[PDB]
Amino acid sequence: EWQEKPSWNTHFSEHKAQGVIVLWNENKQQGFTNNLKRANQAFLPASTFKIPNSLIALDLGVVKDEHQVFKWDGQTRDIAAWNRDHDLITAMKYSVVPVYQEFARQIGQARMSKMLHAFDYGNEDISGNLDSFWLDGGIRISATEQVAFLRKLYHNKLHVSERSQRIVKQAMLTEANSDYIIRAKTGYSTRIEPQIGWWVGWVELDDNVWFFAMNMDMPTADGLGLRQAITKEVLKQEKIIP
């Protein structure tokens, strides 16, 4: 079941922001959100799509392992961190779009489409450009659907090999300390309105896992840091992290 916590709206309004956070207590099989309506509203995934894209590329052997080098093609693109060699870990960390656009070209429309359906991923729709449908094409996913997808990934329940799922969860590693581990991926959809930021992932504790997915209106890139900060405010209010 889900549970609306209207009080959670404070963490968006006090930063002059609008958005939704969805939390799922894995032990209790219970979910929470500040707004049920926006929690089920579907948006472009933008770079959160790197999670399923990585999985498919690994499963098909386009990516051999997490340290295989994807050599820069020498084309100077607008983001300097993209204009160099990467592996899967740094391609995820630096959200290196051209690396993932090449994965999509190699996967191809037929296999991309069939795998998204097998994942039950959002509307499972790849309409648009093969190399950009997750930025300006027809694919859409909600915060609650991100959580459903992530829980399957966490439990190795997607129907790719276990190895492919473990490698992707490695590549999602964002923060770890003696209190918690976070595996997650940011997103920033700017190509079509509404411009939004994403953060989806989970928090591993000693004895529970808490899945999360948030999106928020992002008129300016100046607020991108709020994706993680609002999420962390909610986690601390709920005593999930100190």
Select 120 or 162, whichever has its Cβ closest to a second copy.
162
Structure tokens at 183: 């595996």
Beta strands, E only, 74-149: none
Q: Binding of Cl ion at residue 70 (CB under 5 A)?
A: no
Beta strands, E only, the chain: 19-25, 30-33, 173-176, 181-189, 196-204, 209-217
Give the position of tokens 């997103």: 187
Active site residue 47: yes
Out of 51, 97, 141, 148, point to the residue binding Cl ion (CB under 5 A): 97
Rounded Cα distance between 102 and 128, Å, is 16
CB of 60 to a second copy, least distance (A): 18
Q: Binding of a second copy at residue 152 (CB under 8 A)?
A: no
Q: Binding of Cl ion at residue 39 (CB under 5 A)?
A: no
Q: Binding of a second copy at residue 232 (CB under 8 A)?
A: no
CB of 167 to a second copy, least distance (A): 8
Q: Binding of a second copy at residue 78 (CB under 8 A)?
A: no
CB of 169 to a second copy, least distance (A): 8
Select 57 or 240, whichever has its Cβ closest to Cl ion.
57
Out of 83, 101, 132, 174, point to the residue binding a second copy (CB under 8 A): 174
Which DSSP letter does residue 195 get?
P
Of 13, 47, 142, 178, the active-site residue reads: 47
CB of 177 to a second copy, least distance (A): 6
**CB–CB of 157/167 below 8 Å?**
no
Q: Binding of Cl ion at residue 51 (CB under 5 A)?
A: no
Select 35 or 165, whichever has its Cβ closest to a second copy.
165
Give the position of tokens 């890139």: 221
Rounded Cα distance between 41 and 141, Å, is 8
Q: Provide CB contacts within 8 A for 103, sequence distance 6+.
A: 53, 54, 56, 57, 62, 63
Which range in 87-95, 115-123, 125-133, 142-150 contacts a second copy by CB under 8 A? 87-95
Q: Binding of Cl ion at residue 100 (CB under 5 A)?
A: yes
Structure tokens at 194: 């509404």
Which range in 8-16, 72-80, 166-174, 213-221 contacts a second copy by CB under 8 A? 166-174
Nearest to 197 by CA among 241, 153, 229, 238: 229
User: Peptide bond preceding 194: is omega within 30 degrees of 0, i.e. cis?
Assistant: yes
Type of residue at 206: D
- Enumerate the active-site residues: 47
Where along the sequence are the contacts to a second copy (CB under 8 A)?
89-90, 93, 162-163, 166-167, 170, 173-178, 181, 204, 206-207
